[PDB]
């Protein structure tokens, strides 16, 4: 499986992530992660369902402490880009696991929901986890896996 | 850059949690 193969496979699971994960935690959310396009009976949708359900727990357990980290951090749609990058850079830094790959979605999530609800870009969001993802090489890393359906098989 | 390598250093947590709990 290719590298491009896995980017546009990323779009479709992180697109399905955020729709159920909205779902999940039902504050204003981003009408975009509902309405935007979506095919619930994809493969990559499933996975991305799957993803959503099996966080749930985790997310709630630590979910006053991202909101104080990104309440301060205040991300805009001014300087999201650079800060998605450098977070992302030192995820990966000491090294990839499909827990980090699977924390950088609900990162994303999170940071589009944040410069939602402060703003008047989940379309954005959704190009920096594919990019970063492909040119950093996790694309590769999830392609020498087995793709993404690896991460529901662990 | 304080706040960066908090919410890192969080993701790595709630990433190594993960992955433990899934395997």
Do not use: C
Request: no cysteine; proline share 3%; glycine share 6%.
């Amino acid at each position: 499986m290719s590298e491009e193969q896995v980017a546009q496979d990323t779009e479709e699971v992180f697109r399905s992530y955020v729709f159920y994960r909205h779902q999940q935690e039902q504050a204003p959310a981003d009408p975009e992660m509902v309405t935007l396009p979506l095919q619930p009976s994809s493969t990559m949708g499933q996975v991305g369902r799957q993803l959503a359900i099996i966080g749930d727990d985790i997310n709630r357990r630590y979910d006053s402490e991202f909101q104080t980290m990104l309440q301060h951090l205040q991300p805009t749609a001014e300087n999201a880009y650079e800060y998605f990058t450098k977070i992302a850079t030192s995820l990966f830094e000491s090294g990839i696991n499909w827990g980090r790959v699977v924390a950088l979605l609900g990162f994303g999530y999170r940071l589009a929901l944040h410069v939602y609800q402060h703003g008047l870009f989940l379309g954005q969001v959704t190009r920096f986890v594919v990019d970063f993802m492909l040119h950093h090489s996790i694309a590769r890393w999830i392609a020498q896996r087995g793709g993404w359906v690896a991460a529901l098989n662990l | 850059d304080a706040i960066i390598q908090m919410i890192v250093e969080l993701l790595k947590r709630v990433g190594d949690q993960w992955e433990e709990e899934q395997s």
